[PDB]
Each structure stands twice: as C-alpha cells, then as structure tokens.
Amino acid sequence: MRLPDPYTNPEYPGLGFESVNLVDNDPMIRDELPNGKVKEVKISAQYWGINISYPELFPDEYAFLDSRLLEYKRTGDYLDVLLPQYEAFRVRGDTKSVTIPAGQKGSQIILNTNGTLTGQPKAGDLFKLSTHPKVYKITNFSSSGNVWNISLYPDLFITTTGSEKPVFNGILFRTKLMNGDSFGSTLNNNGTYSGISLSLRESL
Amino acid sequence: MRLPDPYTNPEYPGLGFESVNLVDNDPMIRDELPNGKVKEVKISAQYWGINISYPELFPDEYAFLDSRLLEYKRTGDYLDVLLPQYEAFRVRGDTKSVTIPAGQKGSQIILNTNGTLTGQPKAGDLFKLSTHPKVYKITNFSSSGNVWNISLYPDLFITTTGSEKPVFNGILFRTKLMNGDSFGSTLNNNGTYSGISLSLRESL
Amino acid sequence: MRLPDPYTNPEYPGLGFESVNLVDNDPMIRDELPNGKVKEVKISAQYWGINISYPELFPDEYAFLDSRLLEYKRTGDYLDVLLPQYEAFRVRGDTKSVTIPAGQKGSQIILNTNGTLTGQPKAGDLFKLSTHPKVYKITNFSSSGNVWNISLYPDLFITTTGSEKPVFNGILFRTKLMNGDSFGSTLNNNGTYSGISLSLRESL
Amino acid sequence: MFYSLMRESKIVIEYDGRGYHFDALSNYDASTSFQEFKTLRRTIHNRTNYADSIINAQDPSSISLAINFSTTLIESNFFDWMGFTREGNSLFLPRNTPNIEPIMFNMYIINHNNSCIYFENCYVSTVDFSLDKSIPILNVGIESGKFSEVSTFRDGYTITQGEVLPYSAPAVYTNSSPLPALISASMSFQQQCSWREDRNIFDINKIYTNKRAYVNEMNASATLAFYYVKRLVGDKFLNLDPETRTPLIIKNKYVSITFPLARISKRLNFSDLYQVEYDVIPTADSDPVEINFFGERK
Amino acid sequence: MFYSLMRESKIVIEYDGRGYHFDALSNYDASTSFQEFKTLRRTIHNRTNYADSIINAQDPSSISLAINFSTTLIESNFFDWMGFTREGNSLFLPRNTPNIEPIMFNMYIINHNNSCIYFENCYVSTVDFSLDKSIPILNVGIESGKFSEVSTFRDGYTITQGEVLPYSAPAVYTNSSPLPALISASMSFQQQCSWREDRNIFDINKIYTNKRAYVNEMNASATLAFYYVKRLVGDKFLNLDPETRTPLIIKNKYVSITFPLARISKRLNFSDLYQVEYDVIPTADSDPVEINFFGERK
Amino acid sequence: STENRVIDLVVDENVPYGLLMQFMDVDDSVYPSTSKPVDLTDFSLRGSIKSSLEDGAETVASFTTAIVDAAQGVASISLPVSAVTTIASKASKERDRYNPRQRLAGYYDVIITRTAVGSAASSFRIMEGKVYISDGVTQ
Amino acid sequence: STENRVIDLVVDENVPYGLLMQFMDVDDSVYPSTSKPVDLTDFSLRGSIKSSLEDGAETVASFTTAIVDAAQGVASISLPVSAVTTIASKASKERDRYNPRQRLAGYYDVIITRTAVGSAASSFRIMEGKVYISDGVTQ
Amino acid sequence: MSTENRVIDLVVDENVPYGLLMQFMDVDDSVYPSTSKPVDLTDFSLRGSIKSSLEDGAETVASFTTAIVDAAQGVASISLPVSAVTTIASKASKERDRYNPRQRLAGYYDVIITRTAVGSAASSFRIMEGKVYISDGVTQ
C-alpha cells in the first residue's frame, strides 16, 4: 500500500516529511587484523532505512494518517513510500520498449533504450527494477549512444531475466514499520499532534 | 465509573486533560532474517494505553479528583475515559434495529444498517460493540446500499453472536489505573497540588 | 580513490574538513606493579585514525560526496585522505636517485640522499615509503653529509629491500571508512543535509 | 461615527454587587490582546510560506490606574481588596496570607453612547505611592483574565471619591525622634499573584480566558531618600551601619504607614550633595504593618 | 586628498550583467568589518599579557537602503529579486519558496575619483514600507558576504529611477467596504535567509568570505493602526473579535497589497483617543498575496 | 467572516456583462468547513440599478436573473449590452480615484426570494454596493 | 474586465510589434500544475487605440489581430510597422526627464468574442491599459 | 522589466577599435532550470546605428559594422573601426562624468535583428538599446 503524502492527498498539507533520514544498512563481517589490514566480508543483505519526521499534525490529518497506518497493521501488507528529494524527473519517456539483456549479476548493468529515453540519469539518483522491489542507487553513469552503462551501489539481488524494465521515476520503497509495537501520539492544548515520527525499514 | 472531566464537572477546570497520549500497544515478536526479510509474529492482545497529564490543582479540584480515584481503588471498578477529539457525531439514529450477522471473528464487521442510520462513519473514528468493552478504530469503510463494511484495527476480540449492536458515539475506554501502587501528589507551600499523572491501560 | 576535498573540487566548498582528528591508536598492555613501576607490552600494530566533520551540505555537494562514497563502497577501494596542515614542502628534488640500504627493520631509516635532494625534513612531518602504504611521522632527523638519519614513530612495518624510495610530499592516508554499516544523513525541510561524519581508519 | 476619548470616560469597579466609581482619577492605561499559536509547516514536499495561526486564548490584561487621595477614602478599598485586614480606618498587613486565591472583582471602563469594555476576574497586584514635595498619588495595578464589550453596565452614581486631600509635607520618625533632611519617601505594597493556566484539550477550537489565580506572597516595602547629614563626629544615631530592628513610621497629615520593627539598609551616593537611601522592610517577627487613612482632622 | 561624501555617491546594483542605478535614494547605511580569533594563552610558566589575534574572516555586511517610489517602478525588482513571481506589473507571494538559495547579486557604491566599495553575494532580506500621511518610502535590507575596494565599476546610465510618485492617501478595504479611521498602514515582506558558514581547515591562514545561503522562509505581513470607532451598540462589523479569514486590501493610487484571505488579530490601546491595531497575515490556504505597482493612471 | 454583502461591480463599456454566483453553505463546526452547496428551489433574484439612494430615484437599469444548475447551487446575474449602454449614458463624468477609467453609475442590490416554499415569502437581500462603468476604447 | 490587471504595452519604433497570449484554464485543486490549453476555435479578438479616454477621441490605430494556433490556445495581438510609425507620429512629446525614450500614445483595449452557431454574443474584455512608444535611432 | 531587460550601456575607448562579441542562446527556464541551446543565426541579419539625440532630427554619428562570425552556435559581433571611434570622440559632449572623468556622453544607440528568410517570418526585434559613452585616452 501507499503511505499518504501531499502528492497523493494534497488536501492534507500537514502530511509530508519534515525531515527524512535515508540510512545505509549493510551488515558486514569486519575484522581488524593485527598487521593493520582491515578485512570485511559482505554476507547479510543490505537494506535502506527510512526515518520520517512529521510536522505539527492537526486532528483530521492525523486521523487520516493513523487510519492508513492501522490499515497497514491490519492487512499486514507492505507500506510503500515515495521520497520526494529523489523525484527530480530527469528521464522522460516510456520505458516499456527498453530491454535489459538477460544474464547480468553484480553492480554493473547494461540496458538498451532503443532510442526512446530523453534525459541522462546522473550519479546519486535512484534506480529500481520492474520485477524486484529492491531500490538501488546510481553511483556512476556512462552511455555510448543508446546503450547505457549504470553502476549501482547494491549488487543486483536477482540476475536479469531479459524482461525486467527500468524504473527511473516514481520509485517506492517496500518498507515495514519498526515503531508499531509502542506507537503513541500526544495531543496538545493547542490542538495539534506533536512529534509524530516513523522508523521505517525496507523489507527484502 | 467515569473519570472526572470538564464535561460532567466544569466547576473544576483544572481537571481537564492538559495532554492525552493514546498509545498503541500491540506486542509482536519481530525477527530480521539475514536475507533482508523482516518477519513478525503476533500472539498477545492489543490494548489502548492512555496517559493523562494535569496542571497545578487547587485544593477543591484535587479533593474531588482524589475522592474519585480512592472510590475507584476501593470498589475496584473500571475508570471510563472520554477523549473529546473522538466525539464527532457522524452516525445518528437507532442502533437497535441494525443487525450484525453472527460468526464474524476476523478483523472486519459486515452489518446491515436496514436504512435506520443516517450519515456514514469516517476512517480513523472510534467504533465499539455493545456487548464487549474493547474499543476499535475504523481503518476503512465501504457502503454498498444498506450493508456496511467496517474494517477495524484490533482483530475482533469476540465472535459476533448476532445480538451485538454497533456503538459509534458516546464511546468510553474501560481503563484500569496503572502506577497506582505508588500514587502521590506533592502539596506546595502556595496551596496547590502538583505532580499528578494518570497512566491508564485499557483493561477490557 | 581520493576523498573529495576543496583542493580537487573547490566548486563544492561544503566538502572541506571543518575539523580533523588524527587519532594515535597503538594498543598496549599496560600493567602497574605495586612497587610503583609501570610496565607496558606492545604486540598489535599502530594505525592512524582520522575523523572528519562536515557542515550543512547543499544538495549538489551532498550528491557529489554521496556518489563518491557509494563508489567506494561498490568497488571496495581505499579512500585517500589529504591533510592540508601536513603539506609543507621542505624536501624537493628526485626521490629515484636516493638509495635506502636494505635490512632495516627497526624504527629508523638511514638513507644516502646522494646530494640529489635540497632542504631537510623537519621533526613532526609526515614520511612514507614508496612500496608500503603506511604513513610515518618523523620524530627526529640528523644529517651527517649526504646520509640522513630519519627516526619514525611506528616501527617499520616492512623490512627494506633496497628498492624503496622515500616520499616526503604528496602523502595520502590509505584509509578505510569505518561506521559505514549504519551510514546516513538527515535532510532538513530547508533542503540542506546535516549530520554527516566520516570515521576513517588507516587500513594499510 | 462615535470616537472614544479617554478624557470622556468613567471607571467603575464592581465588587460584591456594588459599583465603586473611582473619580479623582488622574490617568489610567490599559490594553487588550489575544494569544496565537502560529506554526509554519515547511516540508520537503512543500516548503510553504503561509503559516497556520489560530487564536485560542485571551492574553491577560494589565490595567494601571493613578488615583488621587480623597476625603471619603474609597481608595483604601484597594488595600482592602488586595488582602489587608481592616480595623476602623487602619489597614493591617497580616502575618500570613489569608486565602490561597486573591479577591476577584470586575471592572468597567464606561464611555459615551453605551460603549464599554468589561474586564473580569481582576485582582489588585500592586499599590505604590511616593510621599514627596508633589501631591501624593497611588498607582494601583490590576490584572484581568477576560475582557469583553458590553452594551449596558454598572455606574457608581453614589459611591464616588470626594475632593482631593490638600498637600501636606511628609515626615519620617523613629519612635518620636524625627529623621532630618527627607527628600522622597516612596512606599510599595504588592500581592504577587500568578495565573494558573488550565488550557486543556477540551478547549480546542475555543478562546480560553484565565479564571483562577493563587497568591505567591504579599509584602510591604518602602524606599526612603535622605541627604547625608551628621551632627557629631563619629555619630551613633546617623551613620551607614545596618539596623536589624528599629521602629519606623512614615507620617503625613492624612496617612501614616507604620513599621513596628524594620530592617533598614543604607546606601550612600556621592552626588552633588551626598544622599543616603534606606531600604525599609518589616522584620521576621514584626507586628503587622499599619496603614492609617485620615480623611480630615485625623 | 580625496574625502568621501555620502551625498556625492551613486549606488548601482549589478544583476544579470545589467546595472540598476537606484536613483531617488533618500538615505543608505552600510558598514564593513572583519572577524578575529583572539585568544590569550596565559600559562603557569608565563602569565602573558599579549593576545594571539589573527584576522581570518570577513563579517557579513548589512546594507540598508531607503528608496522613494518612482514612475518607472525599478524598485519592484527588489520584490522580484527577493523571490516573488511576476505577472505583468503585479508581484505574487508564491505558495512555496521556489529555490533553496536566494537570488544573488552584486552592488556598487560609487564615489568620485574612481573610488568604490564592491559588495558581492548580496540578497534582499527585508522590504517594508509604511503607507501613512507622509510620503511612502520602502526600506530594503540586503546582506553581503564579501566586500572589496575596486578601481573601475558598473554605472547605470540608462536603468534609473524616474520622478518620485506624488503622495496619495492610503485606504484599506474589506472587499469593497472601506474601513474607517485609518492612521498608519505598515507593510512588511521578508526573505529570512541564513548564511551557511563553511570555514574549514583548508582556509587556515586565509580570509574567509561567506558565499552560499539558504532560505528559511518567506512571508508577507502588515500592521494596521485604526481609531477605535463603533457605529452601533453591539456592532458586528467593527469589534475586537478575531477574524479567521477575511479578504483585505491596503490600497493606494499607485500600489495595492492584496490579501485574498487574512488572519486579523486586534489590539486596543486606551490612549488619548482609543486606537485599535490589526495584525494581518495571510491564512494557510489563502491565494498568493498580491503587490501591484501602478506608475500613472493605474 | 461577519458580513461582506458590500461588493462593487465594475461593468465594461461596449461589452455585455455577466456574473456567475456559486451559492454555497459553509459551516465551521468541523475544522474542515463543510462545502455543502445550497439547493436552488423556489428561488428568484431581483436587482435594479438606481442612481443614488434618495426616494424617487430614476431606475438606470434592471438586472436580468438567470437560474441554472439548481442542484449545485450556482446562478447567474446578467444584463444585455443595450443595458450596459443605457447605464453608461447616465454615469457621472467624475472618475474614480484609484482607476481613471471607472465612473460611478448608481447603486444596486439583489434580493433572493422563496415564494411559498412553505407558505412563506422569505426574501432577503444577498449583496449590495456601487456599480462602476469602465470606459472602453474599442468602440 | 480586469481592473487590477492593467498592463501598459511598449512598442518599439521602426520595428513591427508582436504580442502573443495563451488562453489556458487551470484547476489545481486535484493537483498543482493542472492546466489545459483552451480551445480558441471560432474566437475572434479585436481592439483599437484612441488618443484620449473619452467619447469623441480620435482613433490612432487598430491592432491586426489573428489566431495563430486554433485549439492550442495561442492567440496573437499585433500591428505592422506602418501602424507603429503612425503611432509614433501621433504620440505626445512630453518626454520624461529620466525615461526619455517612452512617450504616451493613447489607451487600448481588446475584446474576445464567440461567433458560434447555436450560441449568442460572448464579448469579453481581456486587455486594458496604455500604449507607450519607445524611441528609436537606427531606423 | 517592460524595457529594463534589453538595455545595456557601451563605452567605446578612444583611439582603439571597439568590438563587442555577442552570443545568442535560447535558454529554457520555465519548463526546467539549467537548459540552454544556441540559436541558429542563419539568415538573422543585424544592423545598428548611433545618434546624438532622440529628437526627430538627429545626426548619425556612427553605425555598427555588424557581422555574423558563426552562422550556427548563435555567435555574432557588432564592431566599429578606429575612424568611427575618433568621430564619436570628436562629436561627443564636453561634460565629463564626475564618478569617472574619462567618460563623456556620446549619444544613443539601437540594434535591430532582421530574420529575413524564404519562410514568411520576416520579423524584426530590437535586442539592444542604451547610451554610448566615450572614454578619453592619451596614448594616441
């Protein structure tokens, strides 16, 4: 499901992140050798962590927000979020006619736009495959005409099967709440819910 | 037994809730696998936690509040707490001619209003059955004619017997006062009592 | 790989080091006998610890820095850190015609400059061999003709093979970024990124 | 239309169901205002420019009156309302504050054409007057909780201040020995109350007005200014040493503030003509401070 | 030698490669200064008396200009540079701040004999003018990062302010109903930016100058002063109650600031003639605040 | 809030005039005010433009009422270009202070009315103000 | 019309004038920047320039109107170089002391109109203000 | 910004051939920041002139010898020779600028670009205007 925000529900401008913390969580078997060399082995999967802080929420906005959150807690599905700082539409066009040749594993990826896309995805922008819900981060870009060579920080979780389509816009993190067990909201005498915050965490 | 509030007792304005804290307590066993998939397990029940804060209290206000609290601790009754922000009257009419089909044990109430109720409940409101003291929040509501499809956050604590009647307005939390083992209030030299806090828990 | 600094990238003035912290990490087993004599034992190696602090970062500065850090974490390279306060050019000339006699495994380098180098290194400067990445500090220097007697704090991590060439200027710390397991930066509502810190450790 | 002139006004204080029209009023100052909760919800989605401000409370008003002394001594009711106990025409400062909450009263500021401003839940928080070479006048300071605009009002036709008392030179005594070279005797009395804000979540979407208050302390104080005068070399009566307990009285032909035992601190200023300044407060075990109000012929 | 007179000066603002010489300047004030790091290293060895002071930064300059209204309306560029969107001759207050960093421009203060002071990296941080019974004038306030002395400069021969607009009495309306008894309408607009100090260890032994800044908020505000006037007993239109949303416009013959929806707070002063004071800010969902600039004949 | 019935109309010379009133019923009991529109049944609007308020004043023109989309509450008040010309003929030669194109043409007010919806003639004035003619250049 | 939206046109001497409008209705309640270009099919705008703002004024020039893109919403108001020369000849000579390039020529308005079968007169005024001539030397 | 945008001042230096280099570029800002492309200046002729005053009867003191150095890339150049600079300096006001004594007023100027082509779009625009000043010199 979709986390409410001013893009989906413009009538509630109180929704919307006062501050978002996009943390990098890659567990590693780090070992500090006696000779000065540091050896680290990556085994556990990496996952983005999102910490959302909300401004002063009025009673109706908080009613909508916690209604959506409680529906999340009820039906048990995943909770998608859209970070707005990465919503710079730097790539126009429709990506259905873009083919990613099969048999690709690792950080590097090669995709052929077939002369369809307009706009260059600069380093630091997000990237997501059509099938898998993992969200990557472009670290370097290099194109030779139509073919694009993109390097992603997390290695491709699944090897491309030749049908996965690039998603350069409207990327949603498939996250799970981490504050659900004890989630309280305080109501002031001024009439606003203060200090509403979420500690999300990408699942899979 | 009702907790004194400036609805029933406006002559004691210091008994108003300076700030309420509706805490969502749903203990779960959350385990994060190394493959990035976070998994949860729910066994125990969900109970609404209410925290009340008070301003400086004059001798008469404190006398009334303390007499009520000692009456509670004497008879072992259940404090009823009313939250003003949840007292918006949307559904009006008779709740006796409405029928709830029996055998509903999930997290969803299907009821035939029989055209006897005007208005429609809004998501995020408070809903409660007439035969059980547990309080529910409406997470979603779809109306197809006279039959309503109300979705509730806590899974139905009872299996409907067909005699339950929905309650939308005038809902009270059948709380039990926690932190009553060491309950006190310091009296300052200026005659006002300070440091009064009620940590209440929904003891259905 | 070089960490972005306002030498190579002056267009991003926010990437400057607001405060560096050169930490001397030489773990030792220190035991204090009751007879007042304190005794130490050294087994493990000494590694220079560098801590970098940053000011508020604009979107472009943070984009560049994050792209570089993600490139590091992708290729598993070694961040090179340049400290401006250690870039005083004293020894100038060619370091290829200078010879270092082999078999030197202590804490002292004896080298015949062969009259090819002008100036003299000062105590407390940074010194490094051309075949090893460990960085040394000159604690003492005595010159008797062309042969120099350079004394180094860390005991020589390698035994000189006779082919090493001293490096006095342009010295970089072959660091590896610690605290990268949970690395993040909060984006405030005013558009600037805050709370960015690099805890680096010299992984020779 | 109707303008509102300060000179064309009438201030009536409503206590116990009777209107105390305080004539002989030299000047009064008052203001009304509201409290706002203005927050700006700038988000990463929309860095907005328009605030979210709602008016939810009435800021307490601070009304100050300057009242001339009068022959009917209605102005002593300000000491009476501020907490002093009464015996005859003399007001005592009680050893302990009698009640937790002050004495509350309403006040009207009448004007022409049925125009009025209604201050409610008022209490007298300050009264100070300077006995000097000018006509004495006591500036009272009251704090209101709720202000309002009303059409009909209470007007004190009968209860009113008489003629102003003629000037009479002040004189300060120790027992019956006069203190020479007086400059300006200033007396100060206070009832330092505090509003108990009880704004709660039941007052959301409503305007809140302060209603109840408690007395932190009462006190009587006086600052005496003299010229540094000595009659002997190494004098004992007149010097700069502190006086732990000494009977003092700041006397006039129409008023006499008595300190049965006083704690005096002295301060010398090397000005054009040397001036000493006293700081008179009653002691710990001193008897109640007296304030006599003599209309005429004592 | 050459002295520098303020009256013999010319202020040219350099934006987009064009010089905006702002004539009709009533008065301007500016200052330049440096930041020091002065520490005294008193030790048990030597309790020294001589400090260790090094000049390492330029304190940002605060330049204030007072500019008369003109027929060519060059002064509206200050609203344009401060962040307002433009359509025709009217300036809108955008719902959200457009960019993170303000609009930067350079400014010259020319004087005779090729003397000049060059303020760089400037931004307009405040603009406020009072519509009153005197000639209106808008005081702009800009903050600089780097100041310098230069020989040749930019002089706006063509782009200049015309003749000052004749005085015209202000009037404030609600829709089209005039508000009676106006005293002084003061409007205020701000771009509350903040300098991002990025002084680092690579700037040691060098003078640092602020270069980049970000916008904390923009706002439009107005304080209206009236006389307390009532036309009826218990009037509804004119009273002291707050107004959550009401259309307001402070209109003149040459300028009209429009609040499509306004939040008004009132404050009454019991002065010689009773005065009420408004506090007008746009509401949360109000349409953009208008500022029209009419040169002549609207 | 309070009352804002007073709004001034600026009609254009040589151009027909038409105003579109979206009648509405806002209630501020709930914090997001209800957007319920009034339902236009048994409603008629009447409005005349008369120079000055004194008795016996000549009728400069008369508004032509249109009721459309009764369900959603909107309505239209208009008058033909001939009415505009008749208004502009009798307008005063003195021009408005803030706009040198407008000239005071008269006063106006429109009056809603319920005609025996409940056997009651519940007619009350909607709005009022002054009508200003704006001199054109095209014709 | 739009009394608050008066804009003064500036025409360069010795240069053909050109000004383009875009009729593009908006509805941002659903989402910001929801703007749909208005169809201008069977719309015909027209205007004029007169020396004074009153009846009996001498006409100076009439804009050569056009509809550049039908159904795209891009209309154009313009006049050829000879008309600009006539304006410069007819313009006043009270040159400002600090804007010595601009002289006042007259006042202008333009009216858009609908001429649709199955419809009626829909004339509406969209522009208003003054026409200022900017002096030129390069001819 | 009715006319404030297309007006800049030129100061021709005495005893030096004055040449100003112009670079046309179609900058797109409303749709998206930081997007600019050159204007294809083929068939986009330029012409300018200078006159002492703005009256109907004014003297043509000089005229720019405009040239399109690059047909594409939107690069053009307006320049006048040494003789024209000398004529301007001789035919200039004797009143010196107080803030810069070397500069004296010479006259006014305009620049019109005429994009005459086969397509019926023979439009003309005034892209520049302002005042012309002469900066005195001694090196001769």
Numbering used by the authors:
A (entry chain Z), B (entry chain a), C (entry chain Y): 1 to 204
D (entry chain G), E (entry chain I): 1 to 298
F (entry chain S), G (entry chain R): 2 to 140
H (entry chain Q): 1 to 140
Q: What do the study's own words say?
A:
When comparing the structures of the tip before and after interaction with FhuA, we could observe that they share a common core from the tail tube down to BHPpb3 and only start to diverge from BHPpb3 distal part. Our tail tip structure includes two TTPpb6 rings that could be modeled. The tube extends through the tip: After the last TTPpb6 ring, it continues with a pseudo-hexameric p140 ring, a hexameric DTPpb9 ring, the proximal domains of the BHPpb3 trimer forming the last pseudo-hexameric ring of the tube. Thus, the tube diameter is conserved, although the pitch and the twist between the different rings are different. The p140 ring is surrounded by a larger p132 dodecameric ring, p140 C terminus making direct contacts with a p132 monomer, explaining the need for a decoration-less ring at this position. The collar is made of a dodecamer of p132, whose position and structure were previously unknown. The dodecameric p132 ring completely surrounds the trimeric p140 ring, with p132-p132 and p132-p140 contacts in both p132 and p140 proximal regions and, to a much lesser extent, p132-TTPpb6 contacts, mainly mediated through the loops and termini of the three proteins. Here, however, the DTPpb9 ring is sandwiched between two threefold symmetric rings (TTPpb6 and BHPpb3), which both have a pseudo-sixfold symmetry. There is a symmetry mismatch between LTFpb1 3-fold, p140/TTPpb6 pseudo–6-fold, and p132 pseudo–12-fold symmetries. This symmetry mismatch is absorbed by the loops and N termini of p132 monomers.
In siphophage T5, the unique RBP is located at the extremity of a central fiber. FhuA, an outer membrane E. coli iron-ferrichrome transporter, is the bacterial receptor recognized by T5 (25). We present the structures of T5 tail tip, determined by cryo–electron microscopy before and after interaction with its E. coli receptor, FhuA, reconstituted into nanodisc. These structures bring out the important conformational changes undergone by T5 tail tip upon infection, which include bending of T5 central fiber on the side of the tail tip, tail anchoring to the membrane, tail tube opening, and formation of a transmembrane channel.
